[PDB]
């Protein structure tokens, strides 16, 4: 629905959704957008209530700003906090190399404190960072990816603990201020206060209490009951607040004359230093969030207070004791109970200009904390609002911060989503985060809520899971970092048709309802009794009568990526999230396939890659060419909307973008326009809608084994190209520098008779491996050689010349047709590192026709190698001929699970067969019931179905007993799965049916070449001449000490030892016995550990001579 | 290095003479250096580039 | 007597060796 350009793959939907797709991706953004805070999100966040919210902005400003001097005579305020703007098409930074951006300027003003006066100058700050579309931000053409670190929530908080010595609940609570030190409270074993502050052994507390002015009556008045405490002021012994304090103070330093700073000073700094010290509003906020509190109190501060401090102190005492709620005076109660890290609530995230923001915080304090600096030195009077600024490290920074902005990480463009996944894609760990080295699986653990939050299934990987994932669908997240899932929030039968956005939190407190769940058509499911989450998630039944909330849809704390492939149901989510992850690494090969089955994520998903060409205007279509598209945009109005095409990936791959239609036509704004990339007919194409059966065969689909057709070739089916830039720098130094002519010594002539005048070749040409590339050249010394030679030069008149003949030449599995010309000089003021003077960068097409043996697979994980081609013919094939699309072993699925790759193909074949319920008479019963409407399948057209919701097996099945029986109206298909081909080669009869069908599928960012290397020798560690692994290298595979150890199993000794010797490094032998080698001889036996030779002296060195003999 | 700064210092020294101590003083903060060419902080305070 | 407890122990070694670093 809603879709302009929609078809319908017709899905299974017996239920209903009055609430509809999000927009997700929007997400941050917002935030950057709400973090500027256009007067966009100033009118967004503006709606839906929202006080008076701030671009994450200002703030920054005022949470310095204004300004003044130390000797409180200067005056410094801002304003103006905003920017200008870019200057690209991006695009053409992306050509153009470098970032995207915008200016800034911005109006401080000083004042003098004296006269006080008047400094105000619309200042320029920063050209800046200027977001995609895609929400991004590509730095110099080249853009990483950055997700929020999850972040459970800052604050003093709380938990019973116990001592197995008496196993007493020595419960507690701890304080973090963001930025604010710490100090904490503690059940203690014996008798009494949990006192220490950030690390100070342990006081008598109101000796700090006190220590404010607290007669020890005030307190046990207020405190005694309250006796455990009682003895605090019993053990207390000491007294005066001062005689405390200072005394503390001591306990503080340690060590100090108690100047009346002892008394309080630093004190309330400590904690009543919003100039320093400086929790989160939020928490802040939180606080509040902690305890009906002031509550009724739009608030904002770091403000500490011994009040509250107190308060939630005997909330302490009142708990470790067993106590439910109560309402501290004024404040209204709070039921009594520790806390949770675990939980999410417990448990905010970041995002960008938060972050950033930080960043810049610093920046400003930084380059800010200066001008103070500078405010006194830069004497009075003309010193403009100006005189004084120099955002530069900032920026530098900031900027910078990219670089080191580890978590900013490169948008895979290997498939649209795929980037997306990345996008969502979430952890909290790194920069100050958390390192894996120090994490409780707990981190990566389980628990309830968790659902309507991200993906349950997937996650990272290696030792990686339980660490990183997104969110889960659609349930937007706290203006603080919290999702915001709404509800079907119930009413008596009747549940109220009504997002309700929620911190699982709340909620918590209420009642969990069933989606998937038979209303009497009013919300009034229809039985009186059900089950729902409690407590604990306490997943529990119930009767059908109470809750206050249902849902929001079936399937939620999904993922999209998880949100892909039926059957789960039956199938492993090990071997699912596997599939998931999995998911991605497809590889947009070329032909452009829609699995005709397929739920309705997909391009409604793919829509979310908003990235086709698509529709800007209900305009009649306009002049249409493979670059663009004018676009008579009705209003007269028009624009040759584009299209790019030949551009490579962070994996090596076109800019294709497909078109749609005709230059004539007339649609409409947003619809679409034309793909190109993963984009099947307006479509993530992604695999192939492929036959192929059931047998493990031959040992073949054995281990792993795969049978694998041929055709395919022929087919193509199997391929795109593949995108190196290729560089290769003219450099400047000692000799000389680096030139790049075309001349050559005695270079071969073609090999040269190919480049251009002065190097290189021209674009589109083809190549092999070793090929010669650059027209490169340097000076190559200065130190004589033999007479010999030069003799033998004057010997042959080869007059050398004497420059570094150097340039480039192809390596190897490389060739294709020129392109890249990346040729930018220094010299030619295209700016560059030192030394050199212009560089090159060229790329080369190479369309990769598909090994066997390597892997590919499709959706219930089920991921498949690619074992072996094999020719058509040779084939077990229709009765009707038409052989498969390959084979399938059996064996895993059972101790796998997954079969709904057998149903889907059922399914497949189905579908791809199409048929129609010949109810007739009356009514498939099974039938009777779901999208009648089917009825049919005209044999082979658009399928989809939801997720935890699609038809049923016996139906299903059942429909196995439909048709649309083909050709000859036949169906050599089975009522049941097994039919009986024959051999595509000996040829008869087979045992006994044949299971069979189709499947889609994906293809793969890894194979050979990805990995495809030994290494005879090269470069090896001018240190520890070991071979020197790289690109040109092959590395050179590293070895293990097991494997030795295996030897020893042996003994071959040699063997190994040679290796210590040989390819380990052996500077002779080597050298040596590579002579023998070259002399072919009863090799140079295993010599000496050498080196170790070098111990000895090593040793020696120490007086430390010794010997065998 | 360091040494040879020394040895032929407080050496160099020598050779003139005077209330030693100088002498005790590098001497031993030889030795020292020493050590540290043995190990550094291994005693006190290890030096660092 | 709201005082935790070691302070000694280590800062007592703290202190002692501290000295010790004090030998150098």
Known sequence: ?1109 | RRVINRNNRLKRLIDLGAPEIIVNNEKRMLQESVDALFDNGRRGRPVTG | FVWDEDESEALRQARKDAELTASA
């Open chain 1, 1 to 1109: 629905n809603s879709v302009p350009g929609a078809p319908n793959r017709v899905s299974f939907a017996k239920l209903r959704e009055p609430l509809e797709v999000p927009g997700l991706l929007d997400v941050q953004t917002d935030s950057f957008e709400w973090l500027i805070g256009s007067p966009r999100w100033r009118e967004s966040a503006a709606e839906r209530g929202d006080v008076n919210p701030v671009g994450g902005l200002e703030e920054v400003l005022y949470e310095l700003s204004p300004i003044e001097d130390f000797s409180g005579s200067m005056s410094l305020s801002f304003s103006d906090p905003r920017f200008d703007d870019v200057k690209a098409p991006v695009d053409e930074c992306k050509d153009k190399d470098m970032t995207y951006a915008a200016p800034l300027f911005v109006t401080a003003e000083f004042i003098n404190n004296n006269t006080g006066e008047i400094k105000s100058q619309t200042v320029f700050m920063g050209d800046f960072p200027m977001m995609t579309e895609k929400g991004t931000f590509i730095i110099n053409g080249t853009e990483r990816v950055v997700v929020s670190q999850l972040v459970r929530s800052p604050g003093v908080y709380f938990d019973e603990t116990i001592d197995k010595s008496t196993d007493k609940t020595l419960h507690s609570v701890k304080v973090i201020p963001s930025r604010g030190a710490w100090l904490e409270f503690d059940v203690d074993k014996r008798d009494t206060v949990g006192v220490r502050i950030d690390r100070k052994r342990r006081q008598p507390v109101t000796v700090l209490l006190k220590a404010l002015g607290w007669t020890s009556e005030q307190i046990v008045e207020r405190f005694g009951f309250s006796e455990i405490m009682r003895s605090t002021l019993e053990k207390d012994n000491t007294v005066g607040t001062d005689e405390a304090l200072l005394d503390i103070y001591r306990k503080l330093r340690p060590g100090e004359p108690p100047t009346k700073e002892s008394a309080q000073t630093l004190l309330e700094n400590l904690f009543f230093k919003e100039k320093r010290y400086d929790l989160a509003r939020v928490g802040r906020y939180k606080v509040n969030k902690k305890l009906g509190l002031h509550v009724g109190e739009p608030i904002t501060s770091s403000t500490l207070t011994e009040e509250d401090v107190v308060a939630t102190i005997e909330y302490l005492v009142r708990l470790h004791e067993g106590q439910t709620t109560m309402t501290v005076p004024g404040g209204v109660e709070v039921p009594v109970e520790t806390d949770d890290i675990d939980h999410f609530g417990n448990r905010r995230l970041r995002t960008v200009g938060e972050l950033i923001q930080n960043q810049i915080r610093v920046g400003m304090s930084r380059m800010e904390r200066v001008v103070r600096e500078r405010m006194t030195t830069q004497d009075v009077e003309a010193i403009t609002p100006q005189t004084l600024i120099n955002i530069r490290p900032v920026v530098a920074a900031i900027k910078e911060f990219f670089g080191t902005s580890q978590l900013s990480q490169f948008m895979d463009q290997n498939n649209p989503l795929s980037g997306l996944t990345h996008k969502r894609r979430l952890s909290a760990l790194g920069p100050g985060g958390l390192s894996r080295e120090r994490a409780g699986l707990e981190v990566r653990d389980v628990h309830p809520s968790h659902y309507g939050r991200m993906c349950p299934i997937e996650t990272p990987e290696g030792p990686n899971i339980g660490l990183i994932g997104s969110l889960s669908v659609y349930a937007r997240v706290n203006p603080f970092g919290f999702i915001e899932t709404p509800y079907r929030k119930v009413v008596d039968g009747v549940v109220s048709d009504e997002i309700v956005y929620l911190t699982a939190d709340e909620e918590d407190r209420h009642v969990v309802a069933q989606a998937n769940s038979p209303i009497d058509a009013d919300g009034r499911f229809v039985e009186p009794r059900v089950l729902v989450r409690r407590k604990a998630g306490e997943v529990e039944y119930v009767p059908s009568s109470e809750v206050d909330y249902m849902d929001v849809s079936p399937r939620q704390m999904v993922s999209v990526a998880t949100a892909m492939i039926p059957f789960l149901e039956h199938d492993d989510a090990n071997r699912a999230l596997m599939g998931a992850n999995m998911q991605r690494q497809a590889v947009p090969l070329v032909r452009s396939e829609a699995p005709l089955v397929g739920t309705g994520m997909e391009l409604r998903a793919a829509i979310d890659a908003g990235d086709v060409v698509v529709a800007e205007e209900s305009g009649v279509i306009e002049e249409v060419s493979a670059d663009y598209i004018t676009v008579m945009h009705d209003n007269g109005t028009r624009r040759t909307y584009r299209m790019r095409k030949f551009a490579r990936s962070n994996h090596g791959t076109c800019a294709n973008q497909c078109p749609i239609v005709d230059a004539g036509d007339r649609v409409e704004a947003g619809q679409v326009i034309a793909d190109g990339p993963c984009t099947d007919d307006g479509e993530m194409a992604l695999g192939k809608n492929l036959l192929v059966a059931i047998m493990p065969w031959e040992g073949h689909n054995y281990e792993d084994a795969i049978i694998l057709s041929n055709r395919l070739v022929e087919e193509d089916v199997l391929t795109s190209i593949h995108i190196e830039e290729h560089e290769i720098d003219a450099r400047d130094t000692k000799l000389g520098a680096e030139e790049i002519t075309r001349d050559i010594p005695n270079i071969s002539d073609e090999v040269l008779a190919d480049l251009d005048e002065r190097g290189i070749v021209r674009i589109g040409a083809e190549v092999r491996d070793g090929d010669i590339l650059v027209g490169k050249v340097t000076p190559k010394g200065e130190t004589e050689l033999t007479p010999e030679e030069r003799l033998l030069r004057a010997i042959f008149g080869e007059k050398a010349r004497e420059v570094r003949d150097t340039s480039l030449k192809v390596p190897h599995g490389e060739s294709g047709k020129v392109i890249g010309i990346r040729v930018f000089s220094r010299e030619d003021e295209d700016e560059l590192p030192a030394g050199v003077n212009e560089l090159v960068r060229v790329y080369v097409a190479q369309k990769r026709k598909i090994s066997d043996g390597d892997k590919l697979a499709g959706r219930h994980g089920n991921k498949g190698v690619i074992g072996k081609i094999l020719p058509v013919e040779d084939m077990p094939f229709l009765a009707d001929g038409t052989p498969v699309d390959i084979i399938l072993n059996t064996h895993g699925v059972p101790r796998r699970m997954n079969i709904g790759q057998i149903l889907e193909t059922h399914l497949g074949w189905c579908a791809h067969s199409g048929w129609k319920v010949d109810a007739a008479k009356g009514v498939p019963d099974w039938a009777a019931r779901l999208p009648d409407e089917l009825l049919e399948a005209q044999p082979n057209a658009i399928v989809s179905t939801p997720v935890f919701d699609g038809a049923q097996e016996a139906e299903l099945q059942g429909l196995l007993s439909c048709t649309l029986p083909n050709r000859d109206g036949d169906v050599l298909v089975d009522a049941d799965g097994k039919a009986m081909l024959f051999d595509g080669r000996s040829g008869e009869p087979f045992p006994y049916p044949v299971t069979v069908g189709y499947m889609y599928i994906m293809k793969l960012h890894h194979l050979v070449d990805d990995k495809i290397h030994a290494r005879s020798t090269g470069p090896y560690s001018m240190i520890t001449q070991q071979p020197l692994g790289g690109k040109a290298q092959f590395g050179g595979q590293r070895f293990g000490e097991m494997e030795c150890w295996a030897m020893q199993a042996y003994g071959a000794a040699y063997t190994l030892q040679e290796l210590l010797t040989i390819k380990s490094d052996d500077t002779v032998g080597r050298v040596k016995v590579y002579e023998a080698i070259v002399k072919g001889e009863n090799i140079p036996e295993p010599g000496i550990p050498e080196s170790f030779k070098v111990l000895l002296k090593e040793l020696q060195s120490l007086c430390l001579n010794v010997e065998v003999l």
